[PDB]
Amino acid sequence: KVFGRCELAAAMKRHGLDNYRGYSLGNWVCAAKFESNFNTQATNRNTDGSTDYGILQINSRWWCNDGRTPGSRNLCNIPCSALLSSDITASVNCAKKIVSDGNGMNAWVAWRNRCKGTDVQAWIRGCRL
Numbered sequence: 086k087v088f089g090r091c092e093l094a095a096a097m098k099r100h101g102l103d104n105y106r107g108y109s110l111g112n113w114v115c116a117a118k119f120e121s122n123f124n125t126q127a128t129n130r131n132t133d134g135s136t137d138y139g140i141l142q143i144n145s146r147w148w149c150n151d152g153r154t155p156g157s158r159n160l161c162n163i164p165c166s167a168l169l170s171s172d173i174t175a176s177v178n179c180a181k182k183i184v185s186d187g188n189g190m191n192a193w194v195a196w197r198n199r200c201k202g203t204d205v206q207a208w209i210r211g212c213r214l
């Protein structure tokens with residue numbers, strides 16, 4: 086599924102990401118835009134041979150099992166394919182674990198490089214939330 090911007094904002098708010106560990110909703114929408122272009126089916130291979138899955142590009146090195154990432158962990162206890170669902174529940178719940186892991190949203194390289202230090206409230210401007 087390709088979400089609309091405000092559609093995703095609303096779904097992420099429903100699931101309690103608004104100010105989760107202090108990150109306002111615009112941070113999460115910004116991260117999704119640059120990670121997946123709001124497309125749940127996005128996959129991208131990393132240089133280390135791991136793959137990133139779904140709307141928030143969650144990586145198989147640490148977080149999900151895709152059966153082809155040697156020496157990897159599965160800390161969200163989920164098949165990676167479940168992160169491609171039109172239902173974002175598994176992605177959000179896993180993202181909550183990642184962002185609590187010590188480095189905040191800096192875990193998402195696209196957030197650090199494209200969202201951090203910018204006016205992220207722009208990403209939810211005009212949305213009825």
Ligand SMILES: [Cl-]
Nearest residue numbers: 089090091092
């Ligand atoms: Cl929308």
Ligand SMILES: [Cl-]
Nearest residue numbers: 089090118123
């Ligand atoms: Cl957009």
Ligand SMILES: [Cl-]
Nearest residue numbers: 107108109112
């Ligand atoms: Cl914030």
Ligand SMILES: [Cl-]
Nearest residue numbers: 109110111206
């Ligand atoms: Cl915001």
Ligand SMILES: [Cl-]
Nearest residue numbers: 128129130131
């Ligand atoms: Cl790729």
Ligand SMILES: [Cl-]
Nearest residue numbers: 150151152153
């Ligand atoms: Cl497997």
Ligand SMILES: [Cl-]
Nearest residue numbers: 152153154155
């Ligand atoms: Cl694996």
Ligand SMILES: [Cl-]
Nearest residue numbers: 151152153154
């Ligand atoms: Cl393969």
Ligand SMILES: [Cl-]
Nearest residue numbers: 157158159160
């Ligand atoms: Cl594990």
Ligand SMILES: [Cl-]
Nearest residue numbers: 096171172173
């Ligand atoms: Cl959803």
Ligand SMILES: [Cl-]
Nearest residue numbers: 106188189190
């Ligand atoms: Cl933090």
Ligand code: NA
Nearest residue numbers: 119120142195
């Ligand atoms: Na990416």
Ligand code: NA
Nearest residue numbers: 145149157158
């Ligand atoms: Na894994």
